[PDB]
Amino acid sequence: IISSYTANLAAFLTVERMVSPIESAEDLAKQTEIAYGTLAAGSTKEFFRRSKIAVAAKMWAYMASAEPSVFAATTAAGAARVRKAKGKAAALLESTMNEYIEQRKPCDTMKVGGNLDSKGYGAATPKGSALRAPVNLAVLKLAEQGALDKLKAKW
Amino acid sequence: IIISSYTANLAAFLTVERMVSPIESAEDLAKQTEIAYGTLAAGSTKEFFRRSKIAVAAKMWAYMASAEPSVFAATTAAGAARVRKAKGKAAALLESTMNEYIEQRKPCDTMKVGGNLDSKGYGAATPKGSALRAPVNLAVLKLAEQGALDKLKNKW
Amino acid sequence: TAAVTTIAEAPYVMLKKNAAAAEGNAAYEGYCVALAAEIAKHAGAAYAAAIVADGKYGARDAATKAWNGMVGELVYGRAAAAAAPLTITLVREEVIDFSKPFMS
Amino acid sequence: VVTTILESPYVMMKKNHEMLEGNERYEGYCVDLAAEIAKHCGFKYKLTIVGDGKYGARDADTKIWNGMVGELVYGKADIAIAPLTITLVREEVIDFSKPFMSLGISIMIKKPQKSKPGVFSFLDPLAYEIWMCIVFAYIGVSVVLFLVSRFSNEFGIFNSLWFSLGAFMRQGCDISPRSLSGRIVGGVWWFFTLIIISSYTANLAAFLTVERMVSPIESAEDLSKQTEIAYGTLDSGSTKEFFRRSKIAVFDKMWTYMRSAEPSVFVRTTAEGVARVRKSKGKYAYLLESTMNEYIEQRKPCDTMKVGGNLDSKGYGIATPKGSSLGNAVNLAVLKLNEEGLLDKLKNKWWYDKGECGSGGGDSKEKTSALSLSNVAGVFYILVGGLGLAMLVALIEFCYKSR
Amino acid sequence: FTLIIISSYTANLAAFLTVERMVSPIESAEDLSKQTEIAYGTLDSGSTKEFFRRSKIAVFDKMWTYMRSAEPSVFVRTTAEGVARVRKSKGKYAYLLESTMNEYIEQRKPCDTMKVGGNLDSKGYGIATPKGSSLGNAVNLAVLKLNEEGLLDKLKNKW
Ligand SMILES: O=c1[nH]c2cc(C(F)(F)F)c(N3CCOCC3)cc2n(CP(=O)(O)O)c1=O
Ligand SMILES: O=c1[nH]c2cc(C(F)(F)F)c(N3CCOCC3)cc2n(CP(=O)(O)O)c1=O
Numbered sequence: 001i002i003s004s005y006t007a008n009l010a011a012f013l014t015v016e017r018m019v020s021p022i023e024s025a026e027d028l029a030k031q032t033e034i035a036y037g038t039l040a041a042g043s044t045k046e047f048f049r050r051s052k053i054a055v056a057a058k059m060w061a062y063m064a065s066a067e068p069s070v071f072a073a074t075t076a077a078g079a080a081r082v083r084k085a086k087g088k089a090a091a092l093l094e095s096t097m098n099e100y101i102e103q104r105k106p107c108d109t110m111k112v113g114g115n116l117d118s119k120g121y122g123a124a125t126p127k128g129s130a131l132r133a134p135v136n137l138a139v140l141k142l143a144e145q146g147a148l149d150k151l152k153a154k155w
Numbered sequence: 156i157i158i159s160s161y162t163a164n165l166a167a168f169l170t171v172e173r174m175v176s177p178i179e180s181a182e183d184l185a186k187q188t189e190i191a192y193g194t195l196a197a198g199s200t201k202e203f204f205r206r207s208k209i210a211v212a213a214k215m216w217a218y219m220a221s222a223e224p225s226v227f228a229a230t231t232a233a234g235a236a237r238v239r240k241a242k243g244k245a246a247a248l249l250e251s252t253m254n255e256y257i258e259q260r261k262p263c264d265t266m267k268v269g270g271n272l273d274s275k276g277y278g279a280a281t282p283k284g285s286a287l288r289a290p291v292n293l294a295v296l297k298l299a300e301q302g303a304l305d306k307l308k309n310k311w
Numbered sequence: 312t313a314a315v316t317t318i319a320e321a322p323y324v325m326l327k328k329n330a331a332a333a334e335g336n337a338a339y340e341g342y343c344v345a346l347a348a349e350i351a352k353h354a355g356a357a358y359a360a361a362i363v364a365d366g367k368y369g370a371r372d373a374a375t376k377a378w379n380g381m382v383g384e385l386v387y388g389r390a391a392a393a394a395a396p397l398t399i400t401l402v403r404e405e406v407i408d409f410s411k412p413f414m415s
Numbered sequence: 416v417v418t419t420i421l422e423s424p425y426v427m428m429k430k431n432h433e434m435l436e437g438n439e440r441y442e443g444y445c446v447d448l449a450a451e452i453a454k455h456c457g458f459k460y461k462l463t464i465v466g467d468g469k470y471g472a473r474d475a476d477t478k479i480w481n482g483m484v485g486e487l488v489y490g491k492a493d494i495a496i497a498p499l500t501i502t503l504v505r506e507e508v509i510d511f512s513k514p515f516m517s518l519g520i521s522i523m524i525k526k527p528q529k530s531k532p533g534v535f536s537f538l539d540p541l542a543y544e545i546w547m548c549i550v551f552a553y554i555g556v557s558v559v560l561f562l563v564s565r566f567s568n569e570f571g572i573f574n575s576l577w578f579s580l581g582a583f584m585r586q587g588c589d590i591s592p593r594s595l596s597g598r599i600v601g602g603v604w605w606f607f608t609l610i611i612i613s614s615y616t617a618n619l620a621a622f623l624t625v626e627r628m629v630s631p632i633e634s635a636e637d638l639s640k641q642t643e644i645a646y647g648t649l650d651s652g653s654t655k656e657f658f659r660r661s662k663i664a665v666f667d668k669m670w671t672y673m674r675s676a677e678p679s680v681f682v683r684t685t686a687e688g689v690a691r692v693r694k695s696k697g698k699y700a701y702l703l704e705s706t707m708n709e710y711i712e713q714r715k716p717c718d719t720m721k722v723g724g725n726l727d728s729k730g731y732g733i734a735t736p737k738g739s740s741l742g743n744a745v746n747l748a749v750l751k752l753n754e755e756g757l758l759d760k761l762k763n764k765w766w767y768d769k770g771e772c773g774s775g776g777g778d779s780k781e782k783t784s785a786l787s788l789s790n791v792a793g794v795f796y797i798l799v800g801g802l803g804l805a806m807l808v809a810l811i812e813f814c815y816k817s818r
Numbered sequence: 819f820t821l822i823i824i825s826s827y828t829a830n831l832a833a834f835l836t837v838e839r840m841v842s843p844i845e846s847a848e849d850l851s852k853q854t855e856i857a858y859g860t861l862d863s864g865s866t867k868e869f870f871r872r873s874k875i876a877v878f879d880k881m882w883t884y885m886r887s888a889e890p891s892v893f894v895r896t897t898a899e900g901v902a903r904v905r906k907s908k909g910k911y912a913y914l915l916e917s918t919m920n921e922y923i924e925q926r927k928p929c930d931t932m933k934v935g936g937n938l939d940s941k942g943y944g945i946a947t948p949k950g951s952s953l954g955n956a957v958n959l960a961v962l963k964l965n966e967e968g969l970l971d972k973l974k975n976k977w
């Protein structure tokens with residue numbers, strides 16, 4: 001009895017120690033028992049459909065067919081589904097919204113792993129207008145002086 | 156402290172040795188990088204990998220293209236020798252039938268692991284539009300049915 | 312009669328011991344000789360084994376479209392049945408007509 | 416006008432077949448094959464599923480072909496892009512492509528899962544030979560200690576067996592040897608017990624930490640020798656006819672077993688066969704076509720698996736009637752598709768990408784659980800047995816001493 | 819009590835010896851400023867150097883005023899010398915370079931280094947074109963389409 005208590009205690013400690021959380025998209029691709037869902041219709045689902053990547057297509061093949069609907073209708077619903085799933089659901093949303101939710105909301109969720117693709121926001125102006133060059137200069141000069149990094153770190 | 160340490164490290168030895176997984180498929184050999192694998196210099200196997208359009212196959216080709224030593228072997232006799240001398244470092248990629256001949260009718264220093272990656276076959280070809288073009292296709296198809304094509308393989 | 316074109320050396324067809332003692336096709340023995348005996352009884356051909364001299368399986372050279380070896384020895388009418396391990400490939404197929412595989 | 420067949424992984428009817436019906440919208444591996452064979456050889460084809468619903472065969476008296484052979488010999492359709500086991504009879508009436516897929520008679524067994532821990536499992540971390548050597552080493556050490564203390568002193572045989580047993584079970588010793596030759600024995604037996612107990616604890620920890628499952632049977636060459644596992648075919652077809660017409664030693668044995676064995680090992684249908692394999696324990700093995708087995712092991716509940724190589728190889732073709740001008744337009748295209756790595760990609764997608772389960776995700780998935788009473792109860796039995804025996808010998812000694 | 823404690827010690831030591839976990843000493847730049855036990859240096863003169871001087875964020879001003887006055891010279895003559903110094907010193911040196919160069923370096927032999935933490939301030943690489951060119955607007959759309967098709971990412975991934 002004493003020998004089999006010590007051996008099993010070593011089994012608990014060893015197995016608990018070699019546990020690895022889902023850190024990147026590749027790990028979530030190889031792993032198959034937690035479900036990940038995007039918005040019903042948006043720039044991210046169409047991304048996956050149009051994407052031709054072994055990892056991405058593997059995910060899209062997964063999200064195409066699932067006994068529950070992995071897709072969520074609203075991003076508010078998507079946040080709730082992950083919280084209630086207790087680790088089962090893994091939403092795929094834009095990085096800025098992820099960093100806003102994990103920070104200015106009760107910390108039940110977190111963002112793990114680098115973003116998969118790239119995008120960008122721009123203070124657009126109508127085609128062929130007189131506020132094109134000065135606005136482009138204003139944005140570039142703001143970013144150089146960090147007035148866009150001081151603002152992001154604020155809100 | 157010394158006795159507790161002895162028991163703990165012995166348990167570590169046994170546990171680690173128990174979770175040993177040999178390279179069994181092509182995917183496992185592709186992910187793992189400790190073992191170098193090399194095809195023949197010029198042949199249908201290398202041209203397969205060059206023309207291969209599969210990510211796992213391309214991953215091997217990207218590896219096999221550049222290596223500090225020449226992973227490629229000039230002769231299939233050389234390829235067998237390189238694996239034996241490398242003591243697990245070299246993993247030749249040859250056709251299934253030759254692999255099964257070498258691991259069997261040669262001193263068992265090597266073995267074949269994992270299913271074959273691609274497919275092909277050996278016909279008993281006849282000149283185009285010849286008079287005996289069919290009574291050979293029929294002959295092969297009957298031999299394969301009665302096993303005379305499988306008794307012979309199990310023999311040699 | 313017909314002339315068969317098998318490759319020289321393999322696990323398939325080999326030189327038996329006392330090769331000089333024996334004569335004709337009987338000097339040769341192997342898997343693909345045992346096979347090319349069975350096919351005779353199903354197609355009636357009375358042959359005499361004749362190994363390719365070059366010792367290559369064959370491909371059209373890039374400079375000159377000249378097939379070599381067994382797939383060459385067949386196209387040019389030198390000998391008919393290629394009772395030997397020719398991989399069934401597209402390029403050989405467009406020139407020569409195979410059988411269904413006897414091995415995969 | 417090309418026929419087909421309804422086998423699920425090859426030509427399937429999608430959800431809401433009423434809305435999506437006909438050649439315009441079908442799903443299947445053979446469907447993509449037909450699409451690509453048309454892309455390489457542009458032609459007008461309409462997907463006309465076989466009316467009979469089965470593959471070719473001829474009745475001895477009727478002498479007619481039915482299914483995708485009758486639909487081709489009698490000009491009812493152009494070709495047949497569907498799994499046809501290339502064979503002598505079919506070839507004699509159709510013109511077969513080069514095999515676009517090769518296969519064989521695989522072996523299907525239930526996935527090996529951890530059994531209930533048996534009684535007397537506590538002595539698993541050490542082999543049987545080690546346990547027996549431990550017993551006889553203890554009995555040798557006690558005898559030698561007795562002889563040593565009785566050359567040159569309460570170490571009688573009874574009182575020395577107790578000392579050796581006390582020293583092994585780590586419990587403190589009542590007395591200790593005083594001479595030199597007794598102390599040598601004491602010291603070396605102490606070392607021995609220390610090493611053995613450390614080895615037992617460590618190997619048990621290894622057993623509990625990483626679990627390693629092994630397939631009970633590897634290949635039919637050993638499945639014939641086992642004979643404690645019942646293995647069965649379909650009722651009648653290529654498999655049963657193959658086994659009866661076989662002449663190799665192993666296969667002839669595997670047929671002689673199944674010809675005379677009760678109950679009915681032969682299964683009415685493949686669905687019943689897989690249901691029987693899944694329901695029963697590892698005592699049932701199923702011998703089916705390699706492709707069907709590979710496909711089945713991927714769908715839910717993923718409770719089965721394929722073990723061993725293919726027993727006998729045969730390929731699938733693309734039939735075409737003898738006089739067709741399309742007869743040679745398919746050989747070359749099939750060979751090119753095979754060489755381009757497109758057919759393999761198609762099969763890979765259709766079978767693994769549309770797979771209910773994945774191997775890598777659950778590769779480790781390791782979780783450890785508390786030792787239930789089932790694991791240990793083999794020692795509770797021994798404890799109570801020893802207590803009963805002790806009371807028994809106490810009464811025997813009492814009755815003998817009273818008279 | 820003593821039985822439980824000795825069993826716990828032996829079991830946890832076995833866990834330590836069986837599977838080993840390595841933790842990065844430093845995670846992000848804020849913790850790197852807080853630690854100050856590890857000396858971190860930039861290149862001598864350049865954007866990655868001039869950024870810290872013209873920076874007013876709380877953490878970055880600390881990370882500058884540290885390396886502004888510290889001996890010896892943390893500032894490195896060239897990136898090759900910086901990576902050589904990081905490889906040489908076991909753990910006392912951290913190098914602040916462009917993200918792309920770091921990601922590329924950690925892939926090359928001997929693969930003795932790694933990149934930790936997010937990007938401190940974002941920049942972009944473009945495709946320059948002189949103002950009056952008729953090719954000026956023929957590249958914006960091409961770049962955006964290449965980015966959207968998943969081709970540029972495929973290129974970077976492969977190479
Ligand atoms: O039709 C062909 N028949 C082949 C037959 C053999 C074998 F029978 F096994 F000898 C081999 N080998 C396997 C690899 O090691 C060397 C020999 C290759 C063949 N190849 C490809 P090649 O390497 O270009 O000759 C063919 O195309
Ligand atoms: O020409 C034939 N082609 C066949 C093709 C298949 C499959 F590939 F699976 F689609 C099958 N199945 C085997 C078990 O899974 C379901 C049906 C049977 C075929 N049969 C009858 P057999 O004689 O029992 O092989 C033929 O005659």
Ligand SMILES: O=c1[nH]c2cc(C(F)(F)F)c(N3CCOCC3)cc2n(CP(=O)(O)O)c1=O
Pocket residue numbers: 863864865866897915916918919
């Ligand atoms: O336009 C510029 N583009 C630059 C691009 C690179 C890189 F991407 F790495 F190639 C670099 N390097 C940083 C370290 O790795 C080697 C050279 C410097 C650049 N600089 C000089 P900076 O002003 O010091 O950044 C520019 O001016």
